[PDB]
Symmetry: C2
Subunit: 255 residues, 2 copies
């Protein structure tokens, strides 16, 4: 009811799944309820890219045009003249939530259909990617296109970052990028004790959707996998980052 | 689950269950953190620590023991007193036949109960409390934590050794292979799993009608399910019934 109380206080629906990999203790709340995944899908996209590309393959330069630019391209629109390596695009996508970077990377792996096939392969039968950015934001209550659950997103993130879906060196690249995320200071990072390391990917969308998925490392112990999702009832509703920070505090306490 | 509560009532036993579908992170729990005497299940965790300290080659090392070293149940070790046995042979005997002397010999090889506990603490297991050798570890009374653990801790520790990076792939398949070929659990978890499902388990039984089984199960299509099913009764000399674990397993499967 600590989570229910937060739902009332922020007038939002909460989706939570946390797993302490050291003890298999979990914290759940509407863990299997669908939410549009928004930008969090960028983390899983790079995971699949790392699966199919050698580290040298990431130095390959990708060329695009102004015509390839979409709604939010903080880094990509600054290099349209020179193109960018896949390594640079993965960096932009994960640390700045660059939409064009996500689109170029998605094309590299075969598009949404291939992304979905690869996730189904690793055991994710829930995440349903269907579109590129920013069209994936066009989700209405009741539909499953471009949605997932807290359990599914957390489990797929764990698969790529902590399990054997990727070899050591590649897991480390993914974790390093996410640890250096620039957009999540007010979310999960704001709800963990000082000294805890966080690797996360945030997201936001229509219906006041505000998400954050992460791997958290206590100073002493095994990592904790956490997915905190949320949405509101109005398409144009505004979100409040504090809901995520507060929900995280409850999770840490519970753990 | 009401289904678990009914089994507890029917068999006059207490159940400790923890199941985790590693592919979906879905779990099935029932008194997951209640302590039970681990009995023979500790043999699987002991071998895990052994593989962690010795190289595959070191496992070839011969071990010499006498009749002095034989205890209350030595189906295998009783046939090699003079020849001796290699660590690999002892591990095999301990895991597949629940050989008690083998367990003790291996326990000594890794440093004794204190060392086993220390290593388990090192991998994240803060509840499993090994203190004695076989068969003394069976001397446990309600309220005491000596030689007890929980379904959650036992399942998690098994997963760490068999499915996680606690052991190199090479040693992990050695452990899984022995357990897959266990000869003592046909009427337990194995009896409650659907046809086509592969099982790697280690059974156990003890005082107060304690009857346990910890396993890694592989469905035809899918990632493994780690499962720990523990049980006990209120009377020290209480008799256990394997059907309880088989039935409890069927519920876990339906749930998953």
């Amino acid at each position: 009811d600590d989570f229910a109380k937060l739902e009332e206080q922020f007038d939002a629906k909460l989706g939570i799944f946390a797993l302490d990999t050291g003890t298999n203790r979990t914290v759940t709340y509407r863990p299997d309820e669908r939410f549009a995944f928004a930008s969090t899908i960028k983390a899983l996209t790079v995971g699949v890219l790392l699966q199919q590309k050698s580290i040298e393959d990431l130095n390959q330069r990708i060329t695009y045009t102004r015509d390839d630019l979409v709604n939010y391209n903080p880094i990509t629109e600054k290099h349209v003249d020179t193109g960018m390596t896949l390594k640079e695009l993965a960096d932009a996508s994960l640390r700045y939530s660059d939409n064009t970077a996500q689109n170029l990377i998605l094309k590299q792996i075969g598009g949404p259909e291939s992304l979905k096939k690869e996730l189904r392969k690793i055991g994710d039968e829930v995440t349903n990617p269907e579109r590129f950015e920013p069209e994936l934001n066009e989700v209405n209550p009741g539909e499953t296109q471009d949605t997932s659950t807290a359990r599914a997103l957390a489990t797929s993130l764990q698969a790529f970052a902590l399990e054997d879906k990727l070899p050591s060196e590649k897991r480390e690249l993914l974790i390093d990028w996410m640890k250096r995320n620039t957009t999540g200071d007010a979310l999960i990072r704001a709800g963990v004790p000082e000294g805890w390391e966080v690797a996360d990917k945030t997201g936001a969308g229509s219906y006041g959707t505000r998400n954050d998925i992460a791997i958290i490392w206590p100073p002493k112990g095994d990592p904790v996998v956490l997915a905190v999702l949320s949405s509101r009832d109005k398409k144009d509703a505004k979100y409040d980052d504090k809901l995520i920070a507060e929900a995280t505090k409850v999770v840490l306490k519970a753990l």
